[PDB]
C-alpha cells in the first residue's frame, strides 16, 4: 500500500424537500445519478424540490493506491501500481506500508476529458472494487498462569537477560541494563521520571545496532531512528504541508511518538 485517502461519503439515498411547502421525498441512486423530482407532489410548483444534503443518506468510500510487491517485481523494473476502492467496513482496515492480498472485481470506468464536458476518453481507467482484504505481513489466563510461577522460578532475572538478543555474543551487563530499561520504574505523582536511559559505545561493526533493532522489534510503542540528519523519521517535531492534501500537519518526532516506550537512537 502506497497511500490511503480520506473518508469519502458516497450518497445512497437523496433527500429532497420543497422550498415552497416543505413537502419531502426520497430518491434512490441509479448507478451514480439522481432522478431529481422536477415537480412537487403536495403542491405543484416546478423546480421547487431542493436536495437537503445532510438529510440524505451516505456510506463510506475510500481510495487506496497499491504497488506491486518488491518480491514480485521483475529484475530492475520500476513498480506497477493499481487503484483500489473500498466501501463500508473494508475502508478503515488497511494503512500505508501494509502488504495485502486484495480480492476484488476488476472494474473499468470512463474518464471525462474535462470536468464540464461529458465527452470521455476512449482509453478507460481501471480500478478494483475491494471484496476482501488479507494482510500478509502481520508477522489471558493461559499466559498469566505460566508467568506467575515463572516469576518465582530461581534466577529468572538471568534467564530473561540471557533471552535478550540470542543472535549476538553475550554482554551480560548490557543485556541486564536493557532488561531493566524495558521494565522501567514506577510512575507516580512528583515529576520524577520512571524512564531509564541507556547509552552504548563502541566501534562501527559492533553488535550495538543489532541490539537496537532487536529491542525495537520487541517492545510496544517503540521507535528506531538515526541521529544523523538523513534519518527516515526525525527525532524533533516539525510542521509540514501534507502533500496529498496541502494542509498543515504537525509531525511529532520519534521522541514524542514513543511517549510510553523505548526510543532507539542509532548513530547518536
Amino acid at each position: 500500500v502506497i497511500r490511503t485517502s480520506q473518508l469519502i461519503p458516497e450518497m445512497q439515498e437523496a433527500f429532497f424537500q420543497c422550498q415552497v411547502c416543505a413537502h419531502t421525498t426520497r430518491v434512490e441512486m441509479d448507478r451514480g445519478r439522481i432522478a431529481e423530482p422536477s415537480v412537487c407532489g403536495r403542491c405543484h410548483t416546478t423546480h421547487s424540490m431542493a436536495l437537503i444534503h445532510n438529510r440524505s443518506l451516505f456510506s463510506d468510500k475510500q481510495m487506496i493506491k497499491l504497488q506491486e510487491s518488491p518480491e514480485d517485481m521483475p529484475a530492475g523494473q520500476t513498480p506497477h501500481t493499481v487503484i483500489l476502492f473500498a466501501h463500508n467496513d473494508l475502508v478503515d482496515k488497511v494503512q500505508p506500508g501494509d502488504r495485502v492480498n486484495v480480492t476484488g472485481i476488476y472494474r473499468a470506468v470512463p474518464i471525462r476529458v474535462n470536468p464540464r464536458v461529458s465527452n470521455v476518453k476512449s482509453v478507460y481507467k481501471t480500478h478494483i472494487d475491494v471484496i476482501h482484504y488479507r494482510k500478509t505481513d502481520a508477522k489471558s489466563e493461559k499466559r498469566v498462569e505460566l508467568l506467575k510461577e515463572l516469576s518465582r522460578k530461581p534466577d529468572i532475572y538471568e534467564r530473561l537477560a540471557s533471552a535478550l538478543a540470542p543472535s549476538i555474543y553475550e554482554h551480560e551487563d548490557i543485556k541486564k541494563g536493557i532488561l531493566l530499561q524495558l521494565f522501567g520504574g514506577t510512575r507516580k505523582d512528583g515529576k520524577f521520571r520512571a524512564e531509564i536511559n541507556i547509552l552504548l559505545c563502541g566501534d562501527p561493526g559492533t553488535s550495538k545496532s543489532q541490539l537496537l533493532q532487536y529491542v525495537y522489534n520487541l517492545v510496544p510503542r517503540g521507535q528506531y531512528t538515526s541521529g544523523k540528519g538523513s534519518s527516515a523519521v526525525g527525532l524533533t517535531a516539525y510542521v509540514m504541508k501534507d502533500p496529498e492534501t496541502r494542509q498543515l500537519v504537525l509531525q511529532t518526532g520519534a521522541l514524542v511518538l514513543s511517549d510510553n516506550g523505548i526510543c532507539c537512537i542509532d548513530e547518536f
Partner: protein, 233 residues
C-alpha cells in the same frame, strides 16, 4: 367581510411540518422553563439573563441535565440533532423573549456540553452524519473570522416585494419563488445586506491528539467549523 372569505389571502405558506422536530421544540422549551437547580430557582432562566447583552448569543446547556429531564427527549436530540437544531434555537428564542426588551432581529443559539460518550477522529464515519457527537483534537491552524450569511432578505426586482428569512444551503441561495403568489419571477432578486442576518464564522483544522493516534499512522486531520459565541475560543 365574511367567515368564508379566507382563501389563503396573500401567502405562499409552508404546510407540511416536521412533527418530531416540533415536538423537540415544544419539549425543549418545557425543559428550559421547568428544569431547576439543586437549590431550585430554575436554572437556564438565570443563565438566559446574560443574553440581553450585546455580543452574547449562545446558551450552553448540560446534556446530563437534559437526560435527567427526560431520557427520550435527550435520545431524540442526540439522534436527530442537526435536523432539530434550528427548532431548539427557536425554542430558546421563545424562551428568552419573556424579557420583552430583547432586540427582535437578534439570533440565539443552543450549545451542548457534558455529552457522556466521546468519539475518535477515526470513528467519524458517515453513520455519524447529523448526530450529536463529542471529539477530542489538537488545533493545528485557525483561519480568520468571517461573517456568514445565515438568512438573506431579498427584493424582487420586477414587483418590489421583499422576501425575508431565505435560509442558506452550502451555496449562496436566492428565493426559489417570489413571495407574491401571482408574480412569475424566479431568478431576478437583489440581496439587502443591511436587513439580512449574519453569523460569525471560523474554520479550524485539527488532528488526532497524541494519545489517540494509532501506532504507525499518519495523523488524520479534520476540519471544524466554529460559529457565533465559539469563534476564536
Amino acid at each position: 367581510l365574511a367567515a368564508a372569505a379566507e382563501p389563503g389571502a396573500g401567502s405562499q405558506h409552508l404546510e407540511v411540518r416536521d412533527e418530531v422536530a416540533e415536538k423537540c421544540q415544544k419539549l425543549f422549551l418545557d425543559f428550559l422553563e421547568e428544569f431547576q437547580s439543586s437549590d431550585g430557582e430554575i436554572k437556564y432562566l438565570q443563565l438566559a439573563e446574560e443574553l440581553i447583552r450585546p455580543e452574547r448569543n449562545t446558551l450552553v446547556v448540560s446534556f446530563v441535565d437534559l437526560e435527567q429531564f427526560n431520557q427520550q427527549l435527550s435520545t431524540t436530540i442526540q439522534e436527530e440533532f442537526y435536523r432539530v437544531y434550528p427548532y431548539l434555537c427557536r425554542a430558546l428564542k421563545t424562551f428568552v423573549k419573556d424579557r420583552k426588551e430583547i432586540p427582535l432581529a437578534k439570533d440565539f443559539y443552543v450549545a451542548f456540553q457534558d455529552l457522556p460518550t466521546r468519539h475518535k477522529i477515526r470513528e467519524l464515519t458517515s453513520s455519524r452524519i447529523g448526530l450529536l457527537t463529542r471529539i477530542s483534537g489538537q488545533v493545528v491552524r485557525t483561519h480568520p473570522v468571517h461573517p456568514e450569511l445565515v438568512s438573506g432578505t431579498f427584493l424582487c426586482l420586477d414587483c418590489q416585494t421583499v422576501i425575508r428569512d431565505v435560509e442558506q444551503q452550502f451555496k449562496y441561495t436566492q428565493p426559489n419563488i417570489c413571495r407574491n403568489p401571482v408574480c412569475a419571477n424566479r431568478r431576478r432578486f437583489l440581496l439587502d445586506t443591511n436587513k439580512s442576518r449574519f453569523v460569525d464564522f471560523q474554520k479550524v483544522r485539527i488532528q488526532e491528539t497524541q494519545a489517540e493516534l494509532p501506532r504507525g499512522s499518519i495523523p488524520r486531520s479534520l476540519e471544524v467549523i466554529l460559529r457565533a459565541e465559539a469563534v476564536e475560543s
